[PDB]
């Protein structure tokens, strides 16, 4: 993909591929609340990194128009305000307030850098994507069981991670404090680059942590012991040794000198820890420190946060921010995600059904199913 | 008024407390015994320092998680389907919040209905 080719393709996509009808269905939420779509904030990033916010639109036609006119490189969705953002200058000071917004989570592979060995920075590979695969299951289950949020849209971020939009009416009316509470409840791996032991579970395992460890276990052997090989050599297993009390460290080292496979080393570590009881949760702390999602509480706490819009185009990879089907999560491949160049090649190879002829169709289908569920909830209620 | 209310709440036995919470449609739980057995292990691991038999001797309440922020935030109460299961100090705070809201509204309305009372000389020397 040639990023110099981005300015050539962006218009066509925004003209014949961007799913505006479903997009308006989403952000309009069945028209129940008046001025809901009209008070939504958008922000655009144009060529040469020119940023504009407090953009609002009257209806789908105005949005389609101004978007096709601007051809933005980035589209971010923001809060629904007390008035129309376009007229925020006209609103008396203090009377312009963000009132409702989806509850959103951003999980970014870059935040896992201190604990992955295959890639670094913005590089991803099939060996590390399983971490995202774990996160979506660990988090989404909580959101479906502990909090009872029923309408959850998971979206690929385009490069390094995934976003989650929780769109239940209750989740859209949550205050800042309630959002911060939700984020802290879901958050376990606490600390920066200056801390080595980032998980310190108490004697009692809270049911949520038990279910997160249960989800982790299913994948741990493949991710950590086979793929990541977190015990390949001394430079790496020294870390895991650094994560357990010194008392057994020596006892482990000799054992790790006689083990040929990291699965064997894990068995040995588990046996040694079991023999050594307050430390019976130490293996769980290691698993969490290598597998549990990291959440930027600043992303989810603030109501006025602008997050990458679904079906955006990644300025560098060119991939489309496509929704991820929860059931088919295990089959999701971030490298097969349609790029803008591929879908423009597909478009120029054959009115409201043009996208069905591209590789974008199944993802718009997943989005349509999610919107159908939202409509059913709006009606039934 | 808030102070007085707090004191009185502080003097309420758990039974009486629940009665109050019901009569005003505050609906802070009360879980059934069958549901309690259904989530026995989860409840046991949720409440800190709760023994098996002692837990069998206790009854929880179901509250929307938006009211248990201070409990949920450090993960000291189980959440299931948007409701926290809170055992039998902080609750008074929530009750008081509700009370205060209501009372403020009421005072506003009363200040709006003042002209009707000023004409009653009998009650003017007192109230004014
Ligand atoms: Zn990798």
Evaluate whether A216 touches A201 at the Cβ level (below 8 Å): no
Structure tokens at A285: 């702390």
Annotated catalytic residues of A are: 41, 106, 108
Cβ-defined contact of B73 to A145 (cutoff 8 Å): no
Resolution of this entry in Å? 11.2
Q: Which positions ≥6 away from A80 have C-beta within 8 Å?
A: A36, A39, A40, A41, A98, A99, A100, A101, A172
What kind and span of H or E run contains A163? strand A161-166
* A145 part of contact set with chain B, CB < 8 Å: yes
- What distance in Å separates the CA atoms of residue A134 and residue A124, rounded to the nearest whole number? 15
Scanning every residue of chain B, which has its alpha carbon at the shortest distance from the alpha carbon of A174? B66
What spacing in Å lies between the alpha carbon of A228 and ligand 1's midpoint? 8
DSSP per position, A294-356: ---HHHHH-TT--EE-TT-B-TTT-BB--B--SGGGGG--TTSSPBHHHHHHHHTT--TTGGG
Evaluate whether A290 touches A283 at the Cβ level (below 8 Å): no
Which of A148, A206, A208 has its CB closest to that of B82? A148
Query: Residue A155 pairs with which residues in a beta bridge?
Result: A163, A323
Q: Coil, strand or helix: which one is B53?
A: helix
Closest CA to A366 of A322, A320, A308, A311: A322
* A190 part of contact set with chain B, CB < 8 Å: no
Nearest-5° Cα angle at A295, A293 to A297: 160
**Method used experimentally:** cryo-EM
Cβ-defined contact of A206 to B45 (cutoff 8 Å): yes
Cβ-defined contact of B73 to A181 (cutoff 8 Å): yes
Interface with chain B: mutation pick from A139, A152, A177, A181, highest number of B CBs within 10 Å: A181
Structure tokens at A333: 């491949």
What spacing in Å lies between the alpha carbon of A44 and ligand 1's midpoint? 31
- What distance in Å separates the CA atoms of residue B97 and residue B33, rounded to the nearest whole number? 30
What spacing in Å lies between the alpha carbon of A161 and ligand 1's midpoint? 12
Q: How many CB atoms lie within 10 A of CB B124?
A: 11
């Amino acid at each position: 993909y040639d990023p110099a080719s981005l300015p050539d393709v962006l218009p066509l996509y925004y003209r014949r591929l961007f799913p505006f009808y479903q997009y308006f269905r989403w952000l309009n939420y069945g028209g129940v609340v008046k001025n809901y779509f009209q008070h939504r904030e958008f922000s655009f990033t144009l060529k040469d990194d020119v940023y504009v916010r407090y953009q609002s639109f009257n209806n789908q036609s105005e949005l389609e128009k101004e978007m096709q006119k601007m051809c933005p490189y980035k589209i971010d969705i923001g809060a629904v305000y007390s008035h129309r953002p376009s007229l925020h200058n006209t609103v008396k000071s203090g009377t312009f307030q963000a009132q409702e917004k989806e509850l959103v989570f951003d999980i970014d592979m870059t935040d896992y850098d201190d604990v992955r060995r295959c890639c670094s920075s913005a590089d991803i590979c099939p060996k590390c994507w399983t971490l995202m695969t774990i996160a979506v299951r660990i988090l989404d289950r909580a959101l479906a069981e502990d909090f009872g949020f029923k309408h959850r849209l998971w979206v690929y971020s385009g490069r390094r991670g995934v976003h989650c939009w929780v769109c239940d009416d209750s989740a859209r009316k949550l205050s800042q404090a309630e959002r911060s509470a939700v984020a802290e409840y879901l958050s376990v791996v606490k600390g920066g680059e200056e801390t080595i032991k980032k998980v310190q579970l108490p004697e009692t395992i809270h049911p949520f942590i038990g279910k997160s460890l249960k989800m982790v276990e299913r994948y741990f052997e493949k991710y950590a012991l086979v793929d990541q090989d977190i015990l390949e050599n001394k430079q790496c297993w020294d870390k895991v040794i650094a994560l357990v009390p010194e008392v057994a460290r020596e006892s482990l080292l000799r054992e790790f000198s006689k083990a040929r496979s990291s699965v064997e080393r894990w068995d040995k570590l588990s046996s040694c820890l079991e023999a050594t009881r307050r430390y019976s949760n130490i293996p769980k702390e290691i698993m969490l420190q290598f597998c549990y999602p990291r959440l930027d509480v600043n992303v989810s706490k603030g109501l006025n946060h602008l997050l990458k819009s679904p079906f955006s185009v990644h300025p560098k990879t060119g991939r489309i921010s496509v929704p991820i089907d929860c059931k088919k999560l295990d089959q999701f491949d971030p490298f097969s995600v349609p790029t803008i160049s591929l879908i423009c090649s597909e478009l120029d190879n054959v009115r409201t059904r043009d996208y069905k002829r591209t590789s974008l169709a199944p993802y718009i289908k997943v989005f349509e199913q999610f919107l159908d569920k939202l409509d059913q909830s709006r009606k039934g209620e | 008024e808030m102070d007085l209310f707090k004191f009185r709440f502080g003097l309420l036995t758990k039974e009486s407390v629940q009665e109050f919470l019901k009569l005003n449609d505050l609906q802070y739980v009360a879980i059934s015994e069958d549901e309690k057995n259904m989530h026995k292990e989860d409840l046991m691991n949720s409440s800190f320092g709760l023994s098996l038999t002692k837990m069998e001797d206790t009854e929880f309440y179901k509250v929307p998680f938006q009211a248990a922020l201070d409990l949920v935030r450090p993960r000291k109460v189980f959440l299931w389907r948007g409701f926290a299961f809170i055992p039998h100090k902080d609750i008074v705070s929530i009750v008081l919040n509700d009370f205060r809201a209501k009372l403020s509204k009421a005072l506003a309305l009363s200040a709006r209905s003042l002209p009707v009372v000023q004409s009653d000389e009998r009650l003017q020397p007192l109230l004014n």
